[PDB]
Amino acid sequence: KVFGRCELAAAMKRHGLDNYRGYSLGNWVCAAKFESNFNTQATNRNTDGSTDYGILQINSRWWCNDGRTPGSRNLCNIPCSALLSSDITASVNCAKKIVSDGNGMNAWVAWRNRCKGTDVQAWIRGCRL
Ligand SMILES: OC[C@H]1O[C@@](CO)(O[C@H]2O[C@H](CO)[C@@H](O)[C@H](O)[C@H]2O)[C@@H](O)[C@@H]1O
Numbered sequence: 001k002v003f004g005r006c007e008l009a010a011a012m013k014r015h016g017l018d019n020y021r022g023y024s025l026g027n028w029v030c031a032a033k034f035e036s037n038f039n040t041q042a043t044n045r046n047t048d049g050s051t052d053y054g055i056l057q058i059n060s061r062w063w064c065n066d067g068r069t070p071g072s073r074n075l076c077n078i079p080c081s082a083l084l085s086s087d088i089t090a091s092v093n094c095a096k097k098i099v100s101d102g103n104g105m106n107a108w109v110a111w112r113n114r115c116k117g118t119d120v121q122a123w124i125r126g127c128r129l
Pocket residue numbers: 046052056057058059062063098103106107108109
């Protein structure tokens with residue numbers, strides 16, 4: 001599924017992301033934009049051999065199991081393939097674990113480099129929420 005911007009904002013808010021660990025809804029929408037371009041099916045192999053999956057590009061080294069990442073933890077206890085669904089429930093539950101892990105949203109490279117410090121409220125502008 002390719003989410004619309006406001007569509008994803010509403011799903012994220014419904015799942016309780018708005019101000020989760022103090023991160024406003026705009027931060028999460030911005031992160032999704034630059035991690036996956038709002039595409040639940042997005043996958044990207046990383047240099048260490050792990051792969052990032054789904055709307056928030058959750059990683060196979062720590063968070064989900066894709067059966068091809070040695071040293072793999074699966075801290076969200078979920079197959080990575082389950083993070084590609086049109087239903088973002090699993091991705092959101094896992095993201096909640098990631099952002100609570102110590103470094104907040106800095107865990108997401110694209111958020112740190114492209115969202116952090118910016119006018120993230122723009123990402124929910126015009127949405128009926
Ligand atoms: O996720 C924990 C830890 O892993 C790092 C390593 O670069 O980021 C990886 O995991 C993120 C969350 O799944 C991915 O978005 C990212 O692309 C992937 O490199 C750290 O940034 C993070 O603290």
